[PDB]
């Protein structure tokens, strides 16, 4: 596994998130859930907790975008870069942007929103790309299809617990 240089991390245990807008590809209950599941993934292995805001600037802002949007790094059309997130910190930091030129699905018949979000929220929390091929933070998304067997690999667990420790048991 790997962390960003200077090892940025949130100095607080409780973080807030906010879904800025929605995608035409999916009904809203499916977007909320994929984000909530994406967060449980990290909660289960650390003392971090998350709550939702509907106004105000949350720590982790989630949005759907096409081409040029509010930053220097515009998206590239269908395929390839699916989404990108910023390392933890103020403002644009911690935010996750998703390319709406992809077809977000709950299934694996396009780009599964849960798996990619789970991956981006890793970046939002302080994890860079983890070299293990079987790890969630590995930079190559493959249309898995078997979300029925998804388990955070030990490498991801090792890497996120180096940042915030194991959860209180």
CA gap 103, 77 in Å, rounded: 11
- Single out the segment in contact with Zn ion by CB under 5 A; choices: 27-35, 67-75, 103-111, 161-169: 67-75
Beta strands, E only, 69-109: 83-85, 96-99, 104-105
97 contributes a contact to Zn ion by CB under 5 A = yes
94 contributes a contact to Ca ion by CB under 5 A = yes
Q: List the binding residues.
A: 25, 59, 69, 71, 76-77, 79, 81, 84, 91, 93, 95, 97, 99-100, 102, 119, 123, 129
Question: For residue 161, how many other CB atoms are within 10 A of its CB?
Answer: 15
Site string for Zn ion, 20-39 (x = CB under 5 A): --------------------
Residue 73 CB, nearest approach to Zn ion (Å): 5
Q: Quick one: tokens of 96?
A: 């996750």
CA gap 49, 40 in Å, rounded: 9
What are residue 111's phi and psi, to 5 degrees?
A: -100, 110
Summarize as ranges the residues that interact with Ca ion (CB under 5 A). Answer: 25, 76, 80-81, 94-95, 99-100
Interface residues with Zn ion (CB under 5 A) are: 71, 97
Catalytic positions are 120
């Amino acid at each position: 596994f790997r962390t960003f240089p200077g090892i940025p991390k949130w100095r607080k245990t409780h973080l807030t998130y906010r879904i800025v807008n929605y995608t035409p590809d999916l009904p809203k209950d499916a977007v909320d859930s994929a984000v909530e599941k994406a967060l449980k993934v990290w909660e289960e292995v650390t003392p971090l907790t998350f709550s939702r805001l509907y106004e105000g600037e949350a720590d982790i802002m989630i949005s759907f975008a096409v081409r040029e949007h509010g930053d220097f790094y515009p998206f590239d059309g269908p395929g390839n870069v699916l989404a990108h997130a910023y390392a933890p910190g103020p403002g644009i930091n911690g935010d996750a942007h998703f390319d709406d030129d992809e077809q977000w699905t709950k299934d694996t018949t396009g780009t599964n929103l849960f798996l990619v979000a789970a991956h981006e929220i890793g970046h939002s929390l302080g994890l860079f790309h983890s070299a293990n091929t079987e790890a969630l933070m590995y930079p190559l998304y493959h249309s898995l299809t078997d979300l029925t067997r998804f388990r955070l690999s030990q490498d991801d667990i090792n890497g996120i617990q180096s940042l915030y420790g194991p959860p209180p048991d």
